[PDB]
Design a protein that fits this description.
The PDB classes it as cytosolic protein. The structure is cut from a larger assembly and holds three copies of chain A (265 residues). The first copy, chain A, is an alpha/beta fold. Chain A contains seven helices and 13 strands. In chain A, strand 7 and strand 8 form a beta hairpin. The interface between A and C is small, with 11 and 9 residues.
Chain lengths: 265, 265, 265
């Protein structure tokens, strides 16, 4: 057995396969960060913190001793509990499709949005600085006319060039901002066909974040430290329902404050 | 012999080859569904229904017994009768072309439109829910200016993204709506060259349906269960004509109500 | 794991072996049908219905299309819940006999009687016609003097001969009717030794049914379609008791209405 207690769940292996596929697809769909950032681990269940390598002054233990407490960032565990009906589970070994995995999908969306907001917006209670607060470049703003977005993006890319940051650059837009750039034409010309040439990397739907971000993807600038990847485990059950949860443990380290521009909403 | 009774038809093998080729080409041309939906079977002549895996409460047979009647969806057989002249058949072994297979073509069009309207518009008498009624996403509408269609399509695709549905997405338009998007330019730029980039799958002529549909083609969301594929069989003949029919038996299962948007006319 | 959730039950493997043996013996003892009828399957967990091969007229989907909905009979699942004490289970690995499996026995009796009454008496809520309602031969009656039973049975067998139905014929009697024919002598001669020669097949105790039935056992006339054979699974437990259930899913098809005579009580 294992800390997930899957062997205790009234969930047949076919329904485990279904819940795993639904969670994996929904998380991969909503998660923006792991396309951009370097993705280190999973280092395992025993990793509690990561070495920042820095040292902190602390009161000496005794005469003439110098004491430096070593700095580290703790890993945070996020867990989203979700309840699936036993009806939907038992239907699976009867060969069903259209078992209602909407609790799994909504849970995986909440988890992906919590991770992505920890990465980009920061999560103070975990001491995750986040790309927005950890960005040294001038904060831009998106206009109300999406036809201006290639201007603000070429501005941000000129900030990145002047800051000395290599490509390949990539741009992340919030869900509505991506809708706008998906509709928009300039004089009938597809404006995302202009963006696909202004931006030499990729243009990414990031529904969790606010405004937009322009980033380098040269590597080494952003590091998502996974302790444990997205895991499905058992909480409880009753006559009608099984309480499961989605869980991961991670921390985000922002190594290069110049490597990002925040485009505020 | 066989339930088609082809051996009883006054139709030479060359004219069977001609009628089969005409029916196959005309059905493949008109049928939209089988390009989008997963296409399971033909499971054979013995399949009468498909397991939905669900269970239905029914009155118990006796004290303390629990009885659950198992849910299933019946297969429907569609048959279109068509009459070809014996003149046109006997001409075939004389090496003719321009034998009048227009009855075969009109029959294959009626059959393809009946299948596609069962899939998309639903067929109440078969308990086929259909994608339109079985779609949970907000119902859109097409504008009178086709230059607006990339907007309504990027709207529907944003609904699909927000609903968490993967691509590759595809768009089906009714015959006139496809004519309109085939003509249209925006500022001279081919508007279907914009659509070919907004839509990462395919843009499909679907003359049977009303308005338009935007769908995912990731698989597993729509399942056309063929009992028997399109089959040509013999009904009767007289001195001048042979009554044939086109027939198939199928059911359509709509597993993912979120995976579709109906764009009403 | 599996839809029975046996791995979740606090029931040691020795007590599983005991409960399986008690259920199997008690079901085989009470079940009359499966000695007479052909017994097809178990076809598996995915079978929801059986093809009757017939076709049903339904409203056409469109001009000139002919639509026939295919007829099928749904499978019914019967479940009898039964509670065994954990005392009786834990006694088993201590090497006990006279663990109180009377809940298992009473459950297997209720299940066997529900199946046999579905087969013979019919089960309207499952659309099981049943041999009694599905018998075309004249309905006989049993007399109050069991010494008349060889007469009524030779009458029924003459009905079967005149109806053109082969042997080997068999006779099923309700529990008291079998008691009566077990006691009875005519002039000291064992009357079941007369019946063993009037009836060339077998004489069967059928406690579930009313009156008696005389049947052919040539095969092909009666078909019990098992989806899943008698299965033991776990519902819940507490500190003192385990709620289990006995379950099967089946349907009965009565192919030859002339092949049976109902001898009413």
């Amino acid at each position: 057995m294992n800390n997930l207690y899957r062997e205790l769940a009234p969930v047949t292996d076919e329904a485990w396969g279904e819940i795993e596929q639904e969670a994996t697809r929904t998380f991969k769909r909503h998660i923006a960060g792991r396309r951009v950032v370097d993705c280190t681990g999973p280092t395992g269940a025993t990793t509690a913190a990561v070495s920042t390598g820095h040292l902190l002054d602390v009161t000496s233990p005794g005469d003439g001793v110098i004491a430096h407490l070593r700095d580290s960032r703790p890993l945070v565990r996020l867990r989203v509990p979700f309840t699936i009906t036993r009806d939907a589970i038992d239907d699976v070994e009867r060969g069903s499709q259209d078992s209602d995995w909407d609790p799994v999908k909504d849970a995986a969306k909440k988890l992906a949005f919590a991770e992505d907001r920890a990465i980009f917006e920061g999560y103070a209670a975990a001491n995750i600085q986040g790309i927005r607060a950890g960005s040294s470049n001038p904060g831009l703003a998106l206009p109300d006319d999406p036809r201006g977005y290639p201007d603000v993006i070429a501005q941000a890319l000129s900030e990145l060039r002047l800051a000395g940051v290599d490509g390949p650059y990539s741009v992340l837009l919030s869900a509505d901002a991506y809708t706008k750039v998906s509709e928009t034409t300039e004089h009938g010309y597809p404006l995302r066909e202009h963006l696909n040439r202004v931006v030499d990397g990729d243009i990414i739907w990031a529904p969790a974040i606010d405004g937009a971000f322009v980033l380098s993807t040269r590597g080494g600038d952003f590091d998502l430290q996974l302790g444990t990847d997205v895991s499905i485990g058992y909480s409880s059950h009753d006559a009608d329902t099984v309480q499961l949860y989605l869980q991961e443990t991670f921390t985000f380290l922002n190594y290069t404050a110049e490597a990002s521009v925040a485009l505020s909403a």
